[PDB]
Structure 1
Amino acid sequence: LHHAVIPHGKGGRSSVSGIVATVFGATGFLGRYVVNHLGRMGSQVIVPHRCEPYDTMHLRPMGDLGQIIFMDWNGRDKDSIRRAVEHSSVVINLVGREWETQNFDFEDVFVKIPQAIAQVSKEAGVEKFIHISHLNADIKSSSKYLRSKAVGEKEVRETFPEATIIKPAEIFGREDRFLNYFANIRWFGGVPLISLGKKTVKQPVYIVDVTKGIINAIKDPDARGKTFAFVGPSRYLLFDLVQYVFAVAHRPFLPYPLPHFAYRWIGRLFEISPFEPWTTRDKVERIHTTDKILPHLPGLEDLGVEATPLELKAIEVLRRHRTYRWLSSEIEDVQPAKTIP
């Protein structure tokens, strides 16, 4: 170890963890938790960002002076990528959109960009590489999102064979597009579900569990060249999960079946939005994709993390969706949803 990266202190804000991490896509939902955890223990974090600097302001309080470094980068320019990684010991890739745009599509963000980061990182001598894939990645999937995840995951593996690839289920948390997505359907009255959501099983995972898994993968030498599946502790039918969301938010729940073709037609309607789409056809498919069971892969327990149950943290996410009448309701008012042994 070079002398500047020998750990020192007691793992606090002013300590030296010895980690020099470049986190791509740090300005997102997962990125803010990864940067927070890295900063807590005194890591040097490089945050290359495409967005406008106002949108990185929430990251600045997460590290001691000089520990959070911001760079500009473009996914299509390799000089920008190489400048951001050439001094790092671990590169973390959290890049992704849930929708396509006129400038970037699922192939671009889930294949070309991850491959370029892995390619440039390897040439720069970066030793650790963590890449976030998806539990349901599949070339036979209806959703181009999941098809692109399968291709990119493969690509990263050849380009950077020692990469740790992490495949989470849907991640729930304060800024998620999962529990919040279901709660915001109330603005349309009833909740449409394909086949009433009785033919779908989800295994959502908690954001902090995923973050701790990523942090523990950096330090663990066993995590190199491995693929992990980060899943929550319980499996639910989609109908029960959405019903549970509305029970915690104390909103009237009026589910009704909607066929795939009709509901695929609603997704394209919302895709017209030149801004962030409320929903897309791809999202409709992903929501209704049953979460795979991959026993051969290691999970959170193999990284020393106890998966946090949904029931213990839903109120943390869903309290703000309640009206004034129900804001103060406590965590014990709603019965847990039915699980699947």
Structure 2
Amino acid sequence: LHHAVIPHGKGGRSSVSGIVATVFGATGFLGRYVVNHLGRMGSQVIVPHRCEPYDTMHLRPMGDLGQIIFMDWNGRDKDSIRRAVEHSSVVINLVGREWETQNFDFEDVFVKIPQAIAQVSKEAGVEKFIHISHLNADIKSSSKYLRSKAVGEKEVRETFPEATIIKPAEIFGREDRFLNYFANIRWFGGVPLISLGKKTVKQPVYIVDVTKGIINAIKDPDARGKTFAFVGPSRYLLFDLVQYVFAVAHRPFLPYPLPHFAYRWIGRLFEISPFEPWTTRDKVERIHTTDKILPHLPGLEDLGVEATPLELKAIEVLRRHRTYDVQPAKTIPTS
């Protein structure tokens, strides 16, 4: 290399951070926070988008003039991927979906597409590659969402050995589908749950913590070829966690049990929607899957990020659901 991009300035909006990053799937929940943190320090952000340009408008104020660049890309087109990555020093992959569409299934978005980005990035000479897997990824899981995650997590680890795979738990935030999910069940009278919510333990993490972890992995030389596990600071039961949400939202709480097979039956009914389904059989699996514990993997604390409690920022997300002090839910001590 003749030289790096030589950061200049005070780290503000008009500075130069020396980061030229291509963010795939930047128009979703997680990319709206990564692009903001990249542009808040004066980074060059290339945003390949598949949707209507009107739907990327909220990203324009996140950077100075000429710092956010938009391109068209196609999931199955290798040439389009190459145009977006050949000028970059880091590529971030946030492509994902919680349901299978007519044209894309979990295999297409979690295995083939992540493999194409990784391979083209290697052929184009990108240095840092960051892939977003799941904490509960496992080829022996009842959810096809989580099975494909595992397969993709390996083919990426083979195509780009020096990749920084980030495996977060369920993320919660303003635009999440985790806490906002356990608040729209009120439209159907009662709150169904498998086993009344018992037997399931979750370790949700904050959106900003996951975003601050991603940024620090770009700037840390000791994150190449390494896998992380971004998890929150507390473990809760799926029952009391949902109990806490309805308390903060201040809505009536009627938790009644429903068997596993019945939940799938109502799961298939919603899948008929040609729009974003309210719920799906796959979604029910992950909501009732216990979050794993992998002590051998580095977590947030290894990147300098301090995990944020769900209690400090539950009100921020559920303020909208209130019509017209809540006691924190119980936690599971680590033995």
- On whether the aligned pair clears a TM of 0.5, the verdict is yes
Q: Structure 1 length normalisation: TM-score?
A: 0.97
Secondary structure of 2:55's partner?
helix
User: CA deviation digits over 1:148-175, x for unaligned, max 9?
Assistant: 0000001100000000000000000000
User: CA deviation digits over 1:18-66, x for unaligned, max 9?
Assistant: 0000000000000000000000000000000001001100000000000
Number of residue pairs matched? 333
User: CA deviation digits over 1:190-222, x for unaligned, max 9?
Assistant: 110000110100000000000000000000000
Secondary structure of 2:140's partner?
coil
1:81 is displaced (CA, Å) by: 0.2
CA distance in 2, matches of 1:296, 1:130: 20
CA distance in 2, matches of 1:306, 1:214: 13
1:189 is displaced (CA, Å) by: 1.1
User: CA deviation digits over 1:272-294, x for unaligned, max 9?
Assistant: 00010000000000000000000
Aligned to 1:168: 168
User: CA deviation digits over 1:71-112, x for unaligned, max 9?
Assistant: 000010000000000000000000000000010000000000
Pairwise mapping of residues 85-124 of structure 1 onto structure 2 (< 5 A)? Answer: 85-124=85-124
| Same amino acid, percent of matched pairs | 100
CA distance in 2, matches of 1:246, 1:5: 49
CA distance in 1, matches of 2:273, 2:92: 31
CA distance in 1, matches of 2:189, 2:199: 22
1:3 is displaced (CA, Å) by: 5.2
User: CA deviation digits over 1:242-286, x for unaligned, max 9?
Assistant: 000000000000001000100011111000000100000000000
1:2–1:270 Cα change, 3 Å: farther
Secondary structure of 2:264's partner?
helix
CA distance in 2, matches of 1:115, 1:205: 27
CA distance in 1, matches of 2:203, 2:63: 33
1:5 is displaced (CA, Å) by: 1.1
Is 1:7 matched up with 2:7?
yes
1:4 is displaced (CA, Å) by: 6.8
Secondary structure of 1:95's partner?
coil
1:16 is displaced (CA, Å) by: 0.2
CA distance in 2, matches of 1:172, 1:162: 29
Moved over 4 A (4+): 1-4
- Cα root mean square deviation, aligned: 0.7
CA distance in 2, matches of 1:6, 1:273: 51
CA distance in 2, matches of 1:193, 1:208: 29
CA distance in 2, matches of 1:2, 1:304: 31
1:296 is displaced (CA, Å) by: 0.2
Q: Structure 2 length normalisation: TM-score?
A: 0.99
CA distance in 1, matches of 2:211, 2:298: 16
CA distance in 2, matches of 1:202, 1:34: 24
1:3–1:14 Cα change, 3 Å: farther
User: CA deviation digits over 1:283-323, x for unaligned, max 9?
Assistant: 00000000000000000000000000000011000000000
CA distance in 2, matches of 1:320, 1:90: 36
Secondary structure of 1:306's partner?
coil
CA distance in 1, matches of 2:293, 2:4: 43
CA distance in 2, matches of 1:140, 1:2: 48
Secondary structure of 2:167's partner?
strand
Aligned to 2:141: 141
1:2 is displaced (CA, Å) by: 5.3
